[PDB]
Amino acid sequence: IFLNVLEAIEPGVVCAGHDNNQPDSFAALLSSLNELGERQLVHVVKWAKALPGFRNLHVDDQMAVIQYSWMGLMVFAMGWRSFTNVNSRMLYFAPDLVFNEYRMHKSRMYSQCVRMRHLSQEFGWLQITPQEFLCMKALLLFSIIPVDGLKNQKFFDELRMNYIKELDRIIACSRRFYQLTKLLDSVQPIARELHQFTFDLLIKSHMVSVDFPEMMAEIISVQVPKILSGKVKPIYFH
Ligand SMILES: C[C@](O)(COc1ccc(F)cc1)C(=O)Nc1ccc([N+](=O)[O-])c(C(F)(F)F)c1
């Protein structure tokens, strides 16, 4: 039942709308990454709200958890698409936004990109199954919380425990749980580097001709700094 649901709500293909017939430029690549990010967020929200037990969470906690986990969720799913679509040869942000090393360099996010390429390869090396991937991704949504707590922390703790239990069931074991939780933890540092980069970019966006969508700018200026300043932190297994 649980896996049937995860499979049923998994988002379909999302395109960036990037002009690939134009020579690569920092400004156009980032504007497409921003637009793609916002298009994906629409889907992440619909996906999250359809998750088993997600409605149990307080209304305000639902929005917060989605906004904080947004980057991580995208990173994890992008790594999977890279592995399944191009065997980690490139980063498959979208069918019309595929990064080769040249674009990784031109985007000024080279180190983060190489770490995501390594993540992509890990899916292959660890032989992650589509079902482990689905459960792990859902678990990522419940892996970052505020130090001062959510409106209903207890409901959040129960839900996270339940998702961990589902992972146990998919696995069923110890060595595998170790491998998967280590892989999950590796997502956070990458999301952090992307958050930092994105934060710095928005602050100087007017200096590099980068276009930030309304909702994204609000989230980067209101939520992301809570993560960067240590007020909101990820939950690591290790
Ligand atoms: C630069 C940026 O547009 C910033 O997007 C944000 C995403 C979340 C957030 F809280 C703040 C900004 C970005 O990283 N976009 C992006 C778009 C798509 C994907 N993707 O499809 O996986 C990613 C990725 F997760 F890879 F890094 C990143």
UniProtKB/Swiss-Prot annotation:
PTM characteristics: Ubiquitinated. Deubiquitinated by USP26. 'Lys-6' and 'Lys-27'-linked polyubiquitination by RNF6 modulates AR transcriptional activity and specificity.
Impact reported for M216T: In AIS; low androgen binding and transactivation
Phosphotyrosine, modified sites: Y236
Stretches assigned to the NR LBD domain: 1-220
Effect of mutating R103H: In AIS and PAIS; almost complete loss of androgen binding
UniProt-reported outcome of changing T84A: In prostate cancer
Complex and partners: Binds DNA as a homodimer. Part of a ternary complex containing AR, EFCAB6/DJBP and PARK7. Interacts with HIPK3 and NR0B2 in the presence of androgen. The ligand binding domain interacts with KAT7/HBO1 in the presence of dihydrotestosterone. Interacts with EFCAB6/DJBP, PQBP1, RANBP9, RBAK, SPDEF, SRA1, TGFB1I1 and RREB1. Interacts with ZMIZ1/ZIMP10 and ZMIZ2/ZMIP7 which both enhance its transactivation activity. Interacts with SLC30A9 and RAD54L2/ARIP4. Interacts with MACROD1 (via macro domain).
Name of the protein described by the UniProt record: Androgen receptor
Organism: Homo sapiens
